[PDB]
Amino acid sequence: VNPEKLLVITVATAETEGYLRFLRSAEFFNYTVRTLGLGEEWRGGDVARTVGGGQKVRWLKKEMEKYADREDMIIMFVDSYDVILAGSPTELLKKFVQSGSRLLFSAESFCWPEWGLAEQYPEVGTGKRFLNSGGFIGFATTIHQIVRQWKYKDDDDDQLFYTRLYLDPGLREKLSLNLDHKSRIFQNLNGALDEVVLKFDRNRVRIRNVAYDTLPIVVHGNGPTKLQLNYLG
Ligand SMILES: O=c1ccn([C@@H]2O[C@H](COP(=O)(O)OP(=O)(O)O)[C@@H](O)[C@H]2O)c(=O)[nH]1
Ligand SMILES: [Mg+2]
Ligand SMILES: [Mn+2]
C-alpha cells in the first residue's frame, strides 16, 4: 500500500508531554497525523476512572464522515498520551496487508471493562485474546461503518462499544474485523511487561516481544506502564 494513503488519527485535548512524545515519533517516521480535540474540554471521564473515553469515538465519528466513501484510504487510530510509534509507515502497511483484516484492533490480556463478556471471545491459545481500543488500523470505509454506530455519552466507555461490535459474529465476519493476537503491530504493555525487551534499531530504542518474536510498530503504555515509554526512541 502507498504510505500516501495512510492517515494517523489521534485525540489530544492538550499538548501534554505524552502527546509531544507521540508526535515526535510520528514525525520522525514521516507519518501524517490528524489530531482531534486540541483546546477542547475533555468530557471523557475523570482521568482516575478506568473506563470512559466515549468523546473520542464521537469526535472520530464526525471526522470519518469525510472519508466514508474513500475506498483507497487506510486510517490508524491511536491514543496519544501514552503511545509511541516505533517503525515506518511502509513497515506498518506491510504488516496490515499481511493481517488479512479490514479493521485490526490491538489485543490485550484482560477482558475489560466487562469481564463477563470474556466467554464470548474465541479462544486463541497463547495469543492475546481480548480487544483494546487504544489502537486500531483499517480501511476508512470499514471504520466509518463501525464508528457511525456511536450514540452514547461522552464519558461512556470506548472499549466496551468496540468490544460489543467485535463480539457480534455476523458483523465480525461481514466487515472482516480482527485482533492483533501476537502483537505484530500493536503492543499493549499492561499485562505483558514480562514479554518485552528493549532492542536497538538504528540507534533508536524500540520493543521486541520475545513471547511472540515480534517488533511492534505501536507501543501503548496503558494502565500503570506509562513511564516505560520514556525508554523508547
Ligand atoms: O484529558 C484527556 C484525557 C485523555 N485524552 C485522550 O484520551 C486517550 C485515552 O486516555 P488514556 O490513555 O488514559 O486511556 P486508556 O488507555 O486507559 O483506555 C489519551 O491517550 C488521549 O489521547 C485527552 O485527549 N485528554
Ligand atoms: Mg480504556
Ligand atoms: Mn491509552
CATH number at residue 221: 3.90.550
**Is the distance from the beta carbon of residue 29 to the nearest atom of ligand 1 less than 6 Å?**
no
**Number of domains comprising the chain:** 1
State the virtual CA torsion across 109, 115, 116, 118 in degrees, nearest 10: -10
CA angle 75, 27, 157 (to 5 degrees): 45
Q: Which ligand is nearest to the CA of 223?
A: 1
25 is in an annotated binding site: no
CA of 202 to the centre of ligand 1 (A): 30
**Is the distance from the beta carbon of residue 25 to the nearest atom of ligand 1 less than 6 Å?**
no
Cell of 146: 463501525
Experimental technique for the deposited model? X-ray
Q: Write the residue with the smallest CA distance to atom 16 of ligand 1.
A: 222
Contact (CB, 8 A) for 10 and 79: yes
Contact (CB, 8 A) for 143 and 165: no
CA of 81 to the centre of ligand 1 (A): 6
The bridge status of strand 177-179 relative to strand 186-188 is unpaired
Residue range of the domain that includes 198: 3-231
Tell me the best of 15, 25, 49, 79 to mutate to test the pocket of ligand 1, counting ligand atoms within 8 Å of each CB and taking the most: 79
Short-list 85, 77, 61, 75, CA closest to 12: 77
CA of 161 to the centre of ligand 1 (A): 16
Sequence length of the chain is: 233
13 is in an annotated binding site: yes
**Is the distance from the beta carbon of residue 12 to the nearest atom of ligand 1 less than 6 Å?**
yes
Beta strands in the chain (DSSP E): 6-11, 33-36, 74-79, 83-85, 103-108, 130-139, 177-179, 186-188, 196-201, 204-209, 218-220
